[PDB]
Design a protein around this nucleic acid. Structure first.
Lengths: 166, 62, 79, 90, 71, 162, 82, 83, 74
RNA sequence: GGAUUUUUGGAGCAGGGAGAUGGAAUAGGAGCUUGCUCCGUCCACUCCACGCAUCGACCUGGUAUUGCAGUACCUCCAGGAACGGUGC
C-alpha cells in the first residue's frame, strides 16, 4: 500500500457517538499536523472505523507510525494507509545533494519515482536497478536520504538510498 | 508574458496566455538541453548501459 | 383531472350542505349551503351554523360571507 | 379611480382624520390602543401620526394597566387591527 | 437608489436571527428579491448544531448583523 | 515572532472538521500567547499547535472560545484566571507539554465547562495516581486522555485523598 | 401618497423601531429601500426580558417592523412634499 | 426572473439534502423536483422532524409556503456559485 | 410566472396530506390547481383518538397544506 | 406591485385541582412598625390524572459486527427517565 494523506483507523469502539469520536480523532490528529477532513460513519459497513485526511503526507505518515496500536476509548485502534485518494484532497489538488539509489524495481516509471521523491521539496533532476536522485537543497537531500533508507515501496525488494561520493 | 512582436494585435487575455504556452513549447523544444539530451555510458559495467542520462552518471560516479 | 373551481361550482349548483374548517382553529367550524363563489374563494352561506366540537353546540347566524383566507378544508355532508 | 375610491370608501374615514384634524383610536394586535391625530396615510394603511397616547395592560410575569405618550410616531398597516373614529377632539 | 446595502456585506460572516429565537451564523454568498440567504458553513445557536450550507428562506428572517471578518 | 494583531489578522481562518470556526496559528513559534483581542471572539477553536508558549495565560474574555489546541508546546504552568476569560472552554488539548507536577492542574479545576482534557505524553502523567488525582480535582471532565471516566474511577478518586 | 418615499428621505436620523416580538432597536437610519429594508449603524437592541446589546451595524426587514418612533424635531411637514 | 438561491436550489437537484419546515419537519433525501417556488418533491424520502418521528416514505412533497430552511451539501458552493 | 406545481405524477394516487392545526387526511387526488388546491375523493381524516372518519370528496387549499406524502410507488 | 409559496403578518393570551406544607435576606397592602390575621405573582416535594401516548438524542451493564468511505440517524436486550417537539 502506498502512503497517502488519508490515514484510516479501524478496530475502534463503536458504542460512542459519531460526533464525539470525530472530535476525539481530530484532537488526536491535531498533535501531528493540520487535519483537513475527518470521515467517520456508523453504518453496518463502516462500523467502528474512521479516517483522517491531512494536508501533508508526512504528518499523516507520522500519525500512522506514532499512533499505531494506540488505545482509543478502551479498544486499540489499528492505523493504516488509505486504498484510494480522498475527494477533498483530489478537489484541492486539481551528506551531498546527489543521492545514489540501489536495488530499484525496473517496472517503476519516472512518475512513481517523482511521487516517491515528492515527500522532499523540489529537486533538480532524476536519473534512471540503480538510480541517481539529485536535489537542489542539501538539507532536503539529507532528509530524503534519511527517509528513504529502508522505505516501504514495492515490498518484494528492499530499496537502499545512500549519499553520492566525489 | 514579455512584450515582443509576437504579441501584437492581440487584445484578449486568454488568447495571449494560449499563444504564450505555444511559443514556450516551441522554443523550449527547439533548444539543445544537454541534461536530458545526452548519451553517457558509465564505467559501472563499462561495456553496457549506454542509456544513462547526464544525472545518473554523476550518481554512479559519486 | 377534476378542478377545484369546477367542484365548487358543482357544489353551488347542487346546493348541498358543506362544512368548512377554519385555519389554525380545530374547535369551531362552519356549516351551510354555498350559493355563490368568487376568485378569492369567498363563500356565501345561507342559514349557516357555527359548530363547536368542544362544547357540542350549534349557533345559527344566517347569511354569512366567509373569506377564502380562513377556510382551510371543505367537506360535503349529507345533512 | 384611486382618488374616488379613497374619498368614497373606508379610506375616507382616514381622510376625515387628516383633513378636519380629528383624533382617532387604533387598536393593534399587541393589545395596545393608541389615540392620536392622523397626519399621513397611504394605500397600505401606513399611518404616520403626531401626539399619540398609547394605553395597554401588563402582567408582572394581580396585573395592572399602563399608558404612555409619544410626540410623533409611524405604524405600518399590517399591525393595525381596529381603527375607530370618534368625536374626542372637541 | 444605489441598492448597495446587501452588496457591501457579500462574502462575509453574518449572524441572522430567526422568528422562533434561533441564530444562524454563516457566510452570506448571495441574495434575491425574497431575501433568500445562503449561509455556507453556518452554525446554529439558541448549544451548537453542525449544519453547514444552510439556505434559509426570507420569511423566517427578522434581523441580521455582522459577526466577524471574512475567512 | 510574538503574537500581535497583524499576525492574527494575516492568519488563516476556516471551518474545521467539527463545523467550527478555527484559526490556524501553527508555525509561528510564539513565546507568549497575547494580543488575542483582534479576533473579537469570532473563532470557536484556537489552533496554537507547534509553538513555544510556556504559560497558558494572558488571554482576554472570549465567550465563543470552546476549543484550545496547545499540542507540541512547552506549557508548564496554567493560569488561575482561566475561568474568568473562557467560561465556555470545553476542549483543552495539552498533549506533549512541560507539565511535571500535578499542582499545575489545580488552576484547571476552575473550568466547570471543561469536559475533554488531554494530558498525554507528559511527565505529570507518569506520576503515581495521576489519573485519580485528575478525576478528583476536575469532576466536570468526562473524557481524560481519550478515555471515558467510569463510576469505579470516580469512586476510587473520591475514596483516596478525601 | 407613497410612504416609501417619505421613509427613504429620513436618512441620518436617530430613530427607533419596535418589532412584533417586543424587540426595540434604536439607531441612526442609514439605508432604506423600496421594501423598507432598514439598514442602521451603531444601533442598540433590547429584546423581551433581555439585556440591551450594541451593534456596529444592523439590517431589519420591513415585514418584521411593527412600529416606529421619530424625534419631535423631525420636519414631517417639509418631508411630506413630494 | 430567477434568483441565485433559486438557481442554487435547482442546480442541487439529485443530491442528498434536507428541508426543514416551519413546524420542524425535516424531509431528507434526494431532491428529485425543485421548482422556482421552493417546491421540493423527493423520492425515497425520510421524515426526521423536530418532533423526532423518524420514518421512511416512498415519495414526499413539501411546498415553499411552510418551508423554513434547506440544508444542502457543500459541493456546489465553489463553482459556479462564486460571484 | 404562475407556474403550476408538478402534480402530474401523483395523479390518481393514494396520498396522505397534512393540514395546519395538526390535521391528517388520506385519499386519492383527482386533479391539480395553480393555487395548490387539491381535490381528494373518498378522503379519510384521522381524529385525535386515532379513528378514521370518511368525509368523501374534499378540497384542501394551499394556504394550510404542510406536506403531502405519496403512499403508492409512482 | 395589501387576496393562498416569501414584504403590509392568523396573531394574541394562559399553564389542571387539593393539602393545619415551606421561603420574599434588602421589595405588598389593610387591621395605621415589630408579632399575628387575610387576600389577586414562583420554585421543591407529596396525592389525584409520575398530565397522557409517540419517536429522536442520551446513561449504565451484557452482547454482535474487524468491515476502505464520503453520511438526516444506525446492532440487539433490560432499567432509568435530565432534553426536544407532535395531538388531546
Amino acid at each position: 500500500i502506498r502512503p497517502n494523506h488519508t490515514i484510516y483507523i479501524n478496530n475502534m469502539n463503536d458504542k460512542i457517538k459519531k460526533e464525539e469520536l470525530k472530535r476525539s480523532l481530530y484532537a488526536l490528529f491535531s498533535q501531528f499536523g493540520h487535519v483537513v477532513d475527518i470521515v467517520a460513519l456508523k453504518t453496518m459497513k463502516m462500523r467502528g472505523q474512521a479516517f483522517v485526511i491531512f494536508k501533508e503526507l508526512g504528518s499523516s505518515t507520522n500519525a500512522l507510525r506514532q499512533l499505531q496500536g494506540f488505545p482509543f476509548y478502551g479498544k486499540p485502534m489499528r492505523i493504516q494507509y488509505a486504498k484510494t485518494d480522498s475527494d477533498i484532497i483530489s478537489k484541492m489538488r486539481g551528506p551531498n545533494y546527489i543521492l545514489f539509489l540501489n536495488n530499484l524495481p525496473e517496472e517503476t516509471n519516472e512518475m512513481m519515482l517523482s511521487m516517491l521523491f515528492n515527500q522532499f521539496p523540489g529537486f533538480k533532476e532524476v536519473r534512471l536497478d540503480i538510480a541517481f536522485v539529485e536535489f537542489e537543497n542539501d538539507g532536503q537531500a539529507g532528509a530524503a536520504r534519511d527517509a528513504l533508507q529502508g522505505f516501504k515501496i514495492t515490498p518484494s525488494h528492499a530499496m537502499k538510498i545512500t549519499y553520492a561520493k566525489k | 508574458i514579455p512584450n515582443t512582436a509576437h504579441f501584437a494585435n492581440v487584445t484578449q487575455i486568454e488568447d495571449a496566455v494560449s499563444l504564450w504556452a505555444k511559443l514556450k513549447l516551441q522554443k523550449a523544444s527547439e533548444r539543445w538541453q544537454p541534461d536530458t539530451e545526452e548519451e553517457y555510458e558509465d564505467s559501472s559495467g563499462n561495456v553496457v548501459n549506454k542509456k544513462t542520462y547526464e544525472d545518473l552518471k554523476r550518481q554512479g560516479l559519486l | 383531472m377534476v378542478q377545484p373551481i369546477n367542484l365548487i361550482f358543482r357544489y353551488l349548483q347542487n346546493r348541498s350542505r358543506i362544512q368548512v374548517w377554519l385555519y389554525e382553529q380545530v374547535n369551531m367550524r362552519i356549516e351551510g349551503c354555498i350559493i355563490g363563489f368568487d376568485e378569492y374563494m369567498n363563500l356565501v352561506l345561507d342559514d349557516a351554523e357555527e359548530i363547536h366540537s368542544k362544547t357540542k353546540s350549534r349557533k345559527q347566524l344566517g347569511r354569512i360571507m366567509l373569506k377564502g383566507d380562513n377556510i382551510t378544508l371543505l367537506q360535503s355532508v349529507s345533512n | 379611480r384611486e382618488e374616488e375610491e379613497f374619498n368614497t370608501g373606508p379610506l375616507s374615514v382616514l381622510t376625515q382624520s387628516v383633513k378636519n384634524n380629528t383624533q382617532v383610536l387604533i387598536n393593534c394586535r399587541n393589545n395596545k390602543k393608541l389615540l392620536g391625530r392622523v397626519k399621513a396615510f397611504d394605500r397600505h394603511c401606513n399611518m404616520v401620526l403626531e401626539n399619540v397616547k398609547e394605553m395597554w395592560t401588563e402582567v408582572p410575569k394581580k396585573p395592572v394597566n399602563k399608558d404612555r405618550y409619544i410626540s410623533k410616531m409611524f405604524l405600518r398597516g399590517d399591525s393595525v387591527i381596529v381603527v375607530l373614529r370618534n368625536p374626542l377632539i372637541a | 437608489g444605489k441598492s448597495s446595502k446587501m452588496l457591501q456585506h457579500i462574502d462575509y460572516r453574518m449572524r441572522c436571527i430567526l422568528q422562533d429565537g434561533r441564530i444562524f451564523i454563516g457566510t452570506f454568498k448571495a441574495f434575491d428579491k425574497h431575501m433568500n440567504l445562503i449561509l455556507c458553513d453556518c452554525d446554529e445557536f439558541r448549544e451548537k448544531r453542525v449544519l453547514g450550507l444552510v439556505l434559509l428562506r426570507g420569511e423566517n428572517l427578522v434581523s441580521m448583523t455582522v459577526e466577524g471578518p471574512p475567512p | 515572532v510574538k503574537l500581535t494583531a497583524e499576525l492574527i489578522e494575516q492568519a488563516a481562518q476556516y471551518t474545521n472538521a467539527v463545523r467550527d470556526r478555527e484559526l490556524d496559528l501553527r508555525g509561528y513559534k510564539i513565546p507568549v500567547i497575547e494580543n488575542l483581542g483582534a479576533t473579537l471572539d469570532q473563532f470557536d477553536a484556537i489552533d496554537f499547535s507547534d509553538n513555544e508558549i510556556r504559560k497558558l495565560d494572558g488571554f482576554p474574555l472570549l465567550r465563543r472560545l470552546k476549543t484550545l489546541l496547545v499540542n507540541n508546546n512547552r506549557i508548564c504552568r496554567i493560569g488561575e484566571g482561566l475561568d474568568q476569560a473562557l467560561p465556555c472552554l470545553t476542549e483543552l488539548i495539552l498533549t506533549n507539554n512541560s507539565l511535571v507536577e500535578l499542582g499545575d492542574l489545580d488552576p484547571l479545576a476552575s473550568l466547570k465547562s471543561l469536559t475533554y482534557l488531554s494530558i498525554l505524553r507528559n511527565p505529570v502523567t507518569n506520576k503515581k495516581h495521576y489519573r485519580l488525582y485528575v478525576i478528583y480535582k476536575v469532576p466536570q471532565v468526562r473524557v481524560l486522555d481519550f478515555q471515558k471516566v467510569k463510576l469505579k474511577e470516580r469512586q476510587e478518586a473520591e475514596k483516596m485523598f478525601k | 401618497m407613497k410612504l416609501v418615499r417619505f421613509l427613504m428621505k429620513l436618512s441620518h436620523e436617530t430613530v427607533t423601531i419596535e418589532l412584533k416580538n417586543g424587540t426595540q432597536v434604536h439607531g441612526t437610519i442609514t439605508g432604506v429601500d423600496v421594501s423598507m429594508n432598514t439598514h442602521l449603524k451603531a444601533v442598540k437592541m433590547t429584546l423581551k426580558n433581555r439585556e440591551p446589546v450594541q451593534l456596529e451595524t444592523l439590517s431589519i426587514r420591513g415585514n418584521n417592523i411593527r412600529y416606529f418612533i421619530l424625534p419631535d424635531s423631525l420636519p414631517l411637514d417639509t418631508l411630506l412634499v413630494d | 426572473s430567477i434568483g441565485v438561491p433559486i438557481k442554487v436550489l435547482h442546480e442541487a437537484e439529485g443530491h442528498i439534502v434536507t428541508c426543514e419546515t416551519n413546524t420542524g419537519e425535516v424531509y431528507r433525501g434526494k431532491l428529485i423536483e425543485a421548482e422556482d417556488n421552493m417546491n421540493c418533491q423527493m423520492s425515497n424520502i425520510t421524515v426526521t422532524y423536530r418532533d423526532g418521528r423518524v420514518a421512511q416514505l416512498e415519495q414526499v412533497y413539501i411546498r415553499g409556503s411552510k418551508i423554513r430552511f434547506l440544508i444542502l451539501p457543500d459541493m456546489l458552493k465553489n463553482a459556479p456559485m462564486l460571484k | 410566472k404562475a407556474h403550476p406545481p408538478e402534480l402530474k405524477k401523483f395523479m390518481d394516487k393514494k396520498l396522505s396530506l397534512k393540514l395546519n392545526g395538526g390535521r391528517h387526511v388520506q385519499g386519492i387526488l383527482r386533479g391539480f390547481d395553480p393555487f395548490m388546491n387539491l381535490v381528494i375523493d373518498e378522503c379519510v381524516e384521522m381524529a385525535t383518538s386515532g379513528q378514521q372518519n370518511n368525509i368523501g370528496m374534499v378540497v384542501i387549499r394551499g394556504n394550510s397544506i404542510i406536506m403531502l406524502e405519496a403512499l403508492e410507488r409512482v
